[PDB]
From a paper:
The elongated structure of the augmin complex is characterised by extensive coiled-coil segments and comprises two structural elements with distinct but complementary functions in γ-TuRC and microtubule binding, linked by a flexible hinge. The augmin complex is recruited to microtubules via a composite microtubule binding site comprising a positively charged unordered extension and two calponin homology domains. By acting as an elongated structural scaffold, augmin positions the γ-TuRC on the pre-existing microtubule in a partially flexible manner, allowing the γ-TuRC to nucleate a branched microtubule in an approximate orientation with respect to the mother microtubule.
Aiming to validate the TIII models predicted by AlphaFold-Multimer using experimental approaches, we purified the X. laevis TIII tetramer after recombinant expression (HAUS1-EGFP-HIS8, 2xFLAG-HAUS3, HAUS4 and HAUS5) in insect cells. Strikingly, the predicted TIII models provided an almost ideal fit into the cryo-EM reconstruction, explaining all resolved density segments on secondary structure level. We next optimised the fit of the highest-scoring model into the cryo-EM density by molecular dynamics flexible fitting (MDFF), which resulted in only minor adjustments. The overall elongated structure of the augmin TIII tetramer is characterised almost entirely by extensive coiled-coil segments that are predominantly formed in a pair-wise manner between HAUS3 – HAUS5 and HAUS1 – HAUS4, respectively. The TIII structure is characterised by a central ‘bulge’ region, composed of all four HAUS proteins, separating the TIII tetramer into two segments. While one of the two segments is assembled exclusively from the HAUS3 and HAUS5 subunits (H3/H5-arm), the other segment is formed by all four HAUS proteins (4H-arm). The N-terminal segments of all HAUS proteins are located in the bulge region, while their C-terminal segments form the 4H-arm. The very C-termini of HAUS1 and 4 are located at the tip of the 4H-arm and are predicted to form a flexible kinked coiled-coil. Cumulatively, integrating structural data from cryo-EM, crosslinking mass spectrometry and neural network-based structure prediction, we could in detail elucidate the structure and conformational plasticity of the augmin TIII tetramer, the functional module for γ-TuRC binding. These data indicate that the core segments of TIII form an overall rigid structural scaffold likely serving for specific binding and positioning of the γ-TuRC relative to the pre-existing microtubule.
Numbering used by the authors:
A (entry chain E): 82 to 288, 405 to 666
B (entry chain C): 97 to 245, 351 to 597
C (entry chain D): 1 to 309
D (entry chain B): 1 to 230
């Protein structure tokens, strides 16, 4: 399959690069997406400020409305008072008395008439008490009718004080005193004249002996009872007049002591609530809305939500954003991984190191052991040993082999030489030189003839015995 | 191949997944880019809305300031009605209130009216009443008559009757004066009551602002709370509040000491250092594998060289050269041939020496030409001699 | 001993140890085998590992509760954003504007309500922020009948948003589901959680397997140089003791022996040769030979003169 | 040896409680190994303690936050978010379940999309690295087996070689002895070769006085005679 296999391995390497190229394109888009996150938290804070401030505004408007109402109440007192003051400043012409004329009119004002009526009703009530005092006793039963005239008196009285200004009333009363006094002055003048004379010129103006005498005694008694009534009435007015003077000083002290310190205190309190909206709104525009958002992690303790360690990376606008992004790259953790994995990951990092450390220690030992064993196991060095093998090899071809071929050759020559030596034995035994004589005779016999004689001679010797060799 | 074919299939399905996720990813990217733009527009829109509510609040502040001022103005205007004179710049004005007015004048008039009644009671009634009937502070007070002071009797009665009428007149006059006082004294009481109401009113109004102020001061401190306010810069010091940064720093540096030298900058530094440490340890193990790879490549190179040198093609551990081993067997064989040749020669040689020892006639045979060349007589003798021992030929 | 080594090396990766260590301290190996169950494969002690696994499950549990509310919360944020963008393009129905207005206002109103509502119990004696309360905020929320209409509507919008959010999830993990029938897609959503869990667990197992194979490769690498050194040691023994010492001596003695043997046999032959010449060629015979030789030479001379002439 | 020894006895006491220690043999090596083990174990015991206490805090912050989104929702949405159909709930649980598995720091798509991408990319990378690492293991397994096959092949071949060398040496002892003798035999022969030569040359020994030359002289004499006549 080798060629198809090579083609497929190429296709895999080619595919792996392409997956990588796609993966790099995905990574680049992911990085832009992480950077492109929703925080609309800035905008939402601003929406929150608008709503908080709308609600705030309504609450302050409610406060304003309370103050408007307070201002109206003070404005009503001030209006009543400005009109009473204005009315008091006028001239009041009263009904004339010269007692010289009774053909004189000025009209009586209402203040005068209304004051004449309430004083007249009370005069009548005082007169019923008086009339009783001469007929000596308060009888029962007129006491209830009396309460009721007192209530009417109060009512005409409450009306006189509210409708008319105090200076006008006072003045009407002043005049009332004068008129009543004038009635006194007419009685004074007519009667004064008589006093240089006789007291019997007083019988011009309002005008058995034992029986007359009694009538004079009873008449003295009558004068005593009227004199006494005058004494209680004079002493009663003297207390009343005094009591008016005390009531004025007491009232004046109260006006001075009680009402006058108030404005400074109102000025103090008023300055404080001047610009409340502006002090508050100024601090609020500086404020941070998630810091106002409180969470309790004990059931008790409110801590600002932003100050939790879990929220630092959710928020891009947090100041710890930079610190905790940096913690993520340093501990080598993805841009989406839960905050809780940083600490477990650091323990894993410490573990990971101890693992690399041990493999390095183990490997260094494996390398060292092999190097010490290579040195012990070499006597001499492998490079020396390889040269020595090669020297010994080159030497067998050069010395040992050629010497052998020389010796093989030498044995073949000796072997051949041995055959020649047999030829030498054969000539020695047979001696063929004997046949080399052509016809040479000595003693007129050839060597052949001598030999034949010899052979024949040995054979005759052998024959005669019955031997042979 | 089956495994490669599945891998090509697998990588291809992955390829197909990444094309599809990527196209969606282009969609999501463009879309988030659109959101990023919209959110910047939302912060601007929201800033505008906010500025309007603050404008509404600028009017409300002005209004409030105005009402506060009215209250100051209102109270300022109110107190002037409660003035006794120290003008004479104005003699146009008079006070309202009865107690604020000069009662000296009315009281003096009442004091003259009493004086007019006193002068009257004194002048027409008997001399004898001089004891005190004169008056003045407020004019004051009548003591009783001597009354006693046929024709004589009738006269006495006439005088008495004149005193009876004159006393009735005094009595009505005092009673009119009493009514006048009674109105007036009640007039101070109705006024005090109005005065009391002002006192009460100002206290309620003042109390409302006082409470409002207290609530205000609580608020003014509260919003100015620095922890509630927007943040400072990052620190360079590990914040005390955060227990997490301290555990993390501890875990990494191997602190369990209380330092004071817990810095963010330090924290990051030791974290990066550890990551660096892991990369170094990995790099060193890689260097150690390469050293190990050199050591093995050397032993293997050694091993092929040594095996190839001892072995002739890979067959067997041969020592000897084939050529030399073959020669040694071949030479030995030549030597064994060579012994035989030797043995042959000596065997023939031995036999022939044994013959010359056994027959003398045969030694002599081989000697005949020696005798031929040297002594013809000796040849004749010896040959003659063998014939002589055992008869020869003759012819005659 | 091989078992103990594998058991300790697989469970605790932080020890370089070999079999020789165990051999020399027979009892120590028993000690090592016992310490592994009291540790774990993590290096942490057994108690600590149990506690860690117990806190993780409990944390995951609370984390699931936060996450159910969190999905819903996020779906609303996404919804309000969606409808608001659509409001700006002028591509929003009137009903959606009402839905949007009611729903936005409700979230701002709850968000500002949550700022006030204190996990403590304020005193009377404390101001809340800006002097307000929840009721001041509900006053600015639109009339209850619109609120009720949005809420009735929200369950259906929420279900569409969930369906969509789950489909999206499905679309990225498994792009294959977008080309499926409606029945098949309903099945595939049901498998979405399980399938992603299987891929993660597989990645973790794949990591465990890498570490296991990493140990094996390193252990095989320990034995392998040691075998290469023995094979060399044997070759070195062959080379040294046999080829260079013994064989050179062997080769020397054989070559010399074979020469000595050849020369000796030759000389022996030569002596027996000389014995033969002495017996054949005595001075007497030689004198006689000289005479025969002269007789043939003299004859040869007579014929030569006659041939020449 | 004594500071290390104390830490190790205590650490070991830490492991077994108030129980006996298992006997072992004392030497340097065993302590050094025990010391690395004790070190790993202590470092991790600290680490796991620190991690557990954070996880307890995180659960409480998360719970606190959970209560906060739940409250936010009750107030904002009313009760209607809790009403869903069965299929609504299933879709929800899956969303939540995908989020818990990929350990997202919220439910946003911006986080979710990188998580799927990273999980797939890593899973394929670890798997491919694991395949390549199996093939290499297997290759190294053949190399080790092959190497071992050579060691035994070498034992056998060395052993046959040793037998050959032992045979050759034994023969070399006989040959070495036979050679010394052969040199001696040669020296003896040589003196006898000169003594004989001296008589033989003095005896007038020469080549034309031999049988072979003399027969050669005789055949030439007959042949020459024929020419001479012709």
């Amino acid at each position: 399959q080798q060629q198809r296999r090579k083609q497929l391995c190429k296709e895999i390497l080619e595919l792996r690069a392409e997956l990588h190229h796609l993966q790099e394109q995905i990574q680049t888009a992911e990085r832009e997406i992480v950077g492109q996150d929703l925080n609309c938290e800035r905008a939402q804070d601003l929406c929150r400020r608008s709503l908080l401030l709308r609600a705030f505004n309504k609450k302050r408007e409610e406060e304003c409305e309370a103050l408007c109402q307070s201002n109206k109440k003070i404005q009503y007192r001030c209006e009543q008072l400005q009109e009473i003051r204005r009315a008091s400043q006028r001239e009041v012409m009263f009904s004339a008395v010269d007692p010289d004329l009774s053909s004189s009119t000025f009209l009586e004002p209402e203040v005068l008439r209304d004051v004449r009526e309430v004083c007249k009703l009370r005069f009548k009530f005082l007169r019923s008490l008086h009339d009783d005092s001469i007929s000596s006793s308060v009888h029962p039963g007129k006491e209830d009718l009396r309460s009721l005239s007192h209530q009417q008196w109060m009512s005409m009285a409450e009306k006189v004080w509210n409708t008319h200004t105090p200076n006008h009333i006072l003045a009407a009363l002043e005049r009332l005193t004068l008129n009543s006094t004038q009635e006194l002055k007419k009685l004074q003048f007519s009667q004064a004249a008589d006093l240089s004379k006789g007291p019997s010129c007083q019988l011009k103006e309002f005008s058995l002996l034992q029986q007359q005498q009694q009538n004079i005694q009873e008449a003295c008694l009558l004068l005593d009872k009227k004199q006494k009534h005058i004494q209680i009435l004079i002493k009663g007015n003297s207390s009343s007049k005094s009591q008016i003077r005390r009531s004025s000083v007491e009232a004046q002290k109260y006006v001075q002591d009680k009402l006058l310190p108030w404005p400074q205190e109102i000025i103090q309190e008023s300055q404080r609530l001047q610009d409340s909206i502006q002090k508050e709104v100024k601090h609020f525009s500086a404020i941070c809305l998630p810091a106002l958002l409180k969470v309790s992690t004990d059931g008790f303790n409110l801590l600002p939500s932003r100050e939790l360690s879990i929220n630092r990376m959710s928020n891009t606008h947090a100041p710890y954003y930079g610190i905790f992004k940096g913690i993520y790259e340093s501990v080598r953790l993805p841009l989406y991984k839960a905050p809780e994995s940083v600490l477990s990951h650091v323990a894993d990092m410490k573990k990971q190191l101890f693992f690399l450390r041990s493999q390095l220690s183990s490997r260094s030992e494996a390398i060292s052991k092999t190097q010490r064993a290579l040195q012990k196991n070499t006597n001499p060095d492998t490079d020396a040993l390889l040269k020595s093998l090669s020297d010994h090899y080159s030497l067998e071809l050069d010395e040992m082999v050629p010497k052998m071929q020389r010796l093989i050759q030498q044995c073949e020559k000796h072997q051949e030489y041995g055959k020649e030596v047999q030829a030498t034995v054969m000539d020695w035994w047979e001696q063929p030189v004997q046949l080399c004589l052509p016809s040479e005779e000595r003693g007129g016999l050839t060597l052949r003839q001598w030999r034949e004689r010899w052979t024949v001679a040995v054979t005759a010797l052998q024959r005669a015995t019955g031997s042979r060799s | 191949i089956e495994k490669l074919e599945e891998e090509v299939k697998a990588l291809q399905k992955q390829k197909n997944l990444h094309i599809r996720r990527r196209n969606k990813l282009q969609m999501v990217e463009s879309g988030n880019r659109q959101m990023c733009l919209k959110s910047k527009d939302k912060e601007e829109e929201t800033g505008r809305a906010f500025q309007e509510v603050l404008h509404l609040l600028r009017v409300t502040n002005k209004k409030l300031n105005h009402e506060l001022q009215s209250i100051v103005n209102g109270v300022q205007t109110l107190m002037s009605f409660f003035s006794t004179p120290e003008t004479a710049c104005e003699l146009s004005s008079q006070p309202i209130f009865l107690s604020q007015l000069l009662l000296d004048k009315y009281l003096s008039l009442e004091e003259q009216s009493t004086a007019a009644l006193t002068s009257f009671t004194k002048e027409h009634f008997f001399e004898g009443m001089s004891k005190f009937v004169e008056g003045s502070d407020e004019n004051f007070q009548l003591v009783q008559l001597n009354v006693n002071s046929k024709g004589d009797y009738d006269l006495q009665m006439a005088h008495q009757t004149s005193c009876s009428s004159r006393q009735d007149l005094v009595c009505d006059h005092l009673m009119k004066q009493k009514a006048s006082f009674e109105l007036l004294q009640l007039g101070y009481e109705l006024e005090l009551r109005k005065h009391r109401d002002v006192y009460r009113e100002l206290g309620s109004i003042v109390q409302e602002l006082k409470e409002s102020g207290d609530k205000l001061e609580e608020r003014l401190t509260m919003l100015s709370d620095v922890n509630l306010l927007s943040a400072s810069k990052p620190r360079s010091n590990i914040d005390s509040k955060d227990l997490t940064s301290h555990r993390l720093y501890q875990l990494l540096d191997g602190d369990n000491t209380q330092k004071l030298f817990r810095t963010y900058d330090g924290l990051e530094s030791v974290a990066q250092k550890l990551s660096q440490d892991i990369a170094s340890m990995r790099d060193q193990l890689e260097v150690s594998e390469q050293e190990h790879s050199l050591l093995l490549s050397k032993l293997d190179s050694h091993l092929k060289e040594l095996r190839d040198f001892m072995y002739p093609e890979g067959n067997t551990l041969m020592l000897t050269t084939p050529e030399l081993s073959g020669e040694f067997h071949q030479l030995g064989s030549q030597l064994e041939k060579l012994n035989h040749i030797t043995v042959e020669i000596l065997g023939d040689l031995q036999l022939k020496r044994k013959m010359l020892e056994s027959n003398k006639l045969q030694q002599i045979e081989k000697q005949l030409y020696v005798y031929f060349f040297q002594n013809e007589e000796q040849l004749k003798s010896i040959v003659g001699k063998l014939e002589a021992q055992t008869g020869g030929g003759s012819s005659a | 001993m091989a078992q103990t080594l594998q058991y300790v090396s697989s469970r605790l990766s932080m020890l370089q140890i070999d079999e020789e260590d165990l051999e020399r301290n027979a009892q120590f190996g028993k000690v090592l085998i016992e310490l592994c169950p009291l540790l774990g494969p993590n290096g942490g002690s057994a108690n600590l590992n149990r506690e860690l696994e117990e806190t993780r499950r409990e944390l995951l549990l609370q984390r699931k509760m936060w996450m159910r509310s969190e999905v819903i919360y996020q779906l609303v944020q996404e919804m309000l954003l969606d409808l608001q963008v659509r409001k700006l393009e002028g591509s929003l129905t009137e009903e959606e504007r009402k839905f949007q207005d009611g729903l936005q206002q409700c979230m701002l109103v709850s968000e500002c309500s949550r700022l006030l509502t204190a996990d403590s119990v304020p005193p009377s004696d404390s101001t809340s922020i800006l002097g307000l309360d929840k009721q001041d905020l509900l006053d600015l929320l639109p009339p209850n009948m619109l609120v009720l209409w949005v809420r009735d509507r929200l369950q259906k919008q929420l279900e569409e948003a969930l369906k969509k959010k789950c489909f999206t999830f499905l679309s990225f993990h498994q792009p294959e589901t977008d080309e499926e029938g409606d029945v098949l897609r309903a099945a595939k959503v049901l498998r979405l959680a399980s399938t992603l869990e299987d891929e993660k667990r597989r990645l973790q197992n794949e990591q465990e397997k890498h570490q296991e194979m990493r140990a094996l490769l390193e252990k095989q690498q320990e034995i392998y140089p040691h075998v290469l050194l023995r094979c060399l040691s044997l070759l070195r023994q062959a080379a040294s003791e046999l080829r260079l010492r013994a064989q050179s001596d062997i080769d020397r003695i054989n070559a010399e022996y074979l020469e000595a043997k050849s020369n000796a046999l030759f000389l022996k032959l030569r002596m027996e040769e000389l014995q033969v010449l002495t017996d054949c060629y005595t001075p007497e015979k030689v004198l006689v030979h000289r005479q025969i030789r002269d007789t043939l030479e003299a004859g040869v001379k007579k014929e030569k003169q006659e041939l020449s002439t | 040896m004594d500071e290390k020894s104390t830490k190790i006895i205590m650490w070991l006491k830490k492991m077994f409680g108030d129980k006996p220690l298992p006997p072992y043999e004392v030497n340097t090596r065993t302590m050094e190994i025990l010391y690395q083990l004790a070190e790993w174990n202590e470092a991790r015991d600290k680490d796991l303690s620190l991690v557990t206490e954070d996880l307890k805090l995180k659960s409480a912050e998360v719970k606190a936050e959970a209560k906060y989104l739940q409250d936010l929702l009750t107030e904002g949405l009313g009760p209607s978010y809790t009403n869903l159909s069965r299929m609504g709930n299933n879709y929800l649980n899956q969303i939540v379940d995908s989020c818990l598995a990929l350990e997202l720091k919220n439910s946003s798509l911006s986080s979710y999309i990188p998580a799927v991408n990273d999980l797939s990319s890593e899973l394929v990378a670890i798997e491919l690295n694991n395949q390549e690492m199996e093939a290499e293991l297997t290759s190294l397994r053949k190399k080790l087996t092959e190497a071992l096959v050579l060691e035994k092949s070498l034992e056998r071949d060395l052993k046959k070689a040793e037998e050959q060398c032992n045979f050759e040496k034994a023969k070399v002892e006989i040959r070495s002895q036979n050679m010394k003798k052969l040199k001696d035999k040669s020296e003896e022969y040589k003196y006898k070769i000169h003594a004989a030569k001296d008589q033989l040359s003095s005896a007038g020994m020469e080549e034309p006085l031999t049988h072979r030359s003399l027969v050669s002289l005789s055949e030439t004499l007959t042949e020459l005679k024929a020419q001479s006549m012709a």
